[PDB]
Amino acid sequence: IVEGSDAEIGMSPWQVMLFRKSPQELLCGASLISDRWVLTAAHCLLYPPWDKNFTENDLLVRIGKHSRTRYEANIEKISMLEKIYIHPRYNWRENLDRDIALMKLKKPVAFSDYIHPVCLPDRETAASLLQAGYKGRVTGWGNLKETWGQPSVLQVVNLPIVERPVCKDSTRIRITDNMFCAGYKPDEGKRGDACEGDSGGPFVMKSPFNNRWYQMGIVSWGEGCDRDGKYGFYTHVFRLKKWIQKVIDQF
């Protein structure tokens, strides 16, 4: 997270850390959606241009974390992966369209003051909240800048959703309906954006009617980090809720 600030304890109880068993390494961010499922981006688990293509055994899921490095005994829970589900229409070849993947835990996780699931969005939630101008929150342990560095604590940043026109002609990359971009405009003043290490993390919004948080998106891609005239792109969660319910109800 660039231009972010330290997260308060329990500010993002659904924040998940995707960890590489060997060699030890922080791969991506993710979200706890139930005591059994974790949502994350597809390029985190599979992306051959970097020859990234993990299998359960390779990864571990660390929940309830605050500190980036330290193993927080009795607070964070570590879970093994039963199965990895990557969207069949996921397209990395061109622009990472339909960038999403679910992960079932071998054993259900117990919730706590530090471990709580976020809500997925429904039609009412999307139509209502995914509006340009409306702000969302992004969290992560990713780098603090394009180059250098790394945070010692989970980083948080709030970002405004940008109209599709501005996004589309803000890049030479093809922007699909499964994507949405967010960030501050060059002149607005304020800054911020996710960055390496934040991918797969959540972009949540808080409903004004029920006080509940909904994950509207997943950090997908961006050209650099916190560049002007540029924006971060997020997987449009709802637009793909069909696939989610599919694999959750079926598996």
């Binding site: 809500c119 929150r137 006080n211």
Partner: peptide, 27 residues
């Protein structure tokens, strides 16, 4: 079911440092 409600925040009627910025972006 009980999703999106933070034990240390909503559950205790306490707001975090910046959630208010979010609620205001709706105006």
């Amino acid at each position: 079911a009980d999703c999106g409600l933070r034990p240390l925040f909503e559950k205790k009627s306490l707001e975090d440092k910046t959630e208010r910025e979010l609620l205001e972006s709706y105006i």
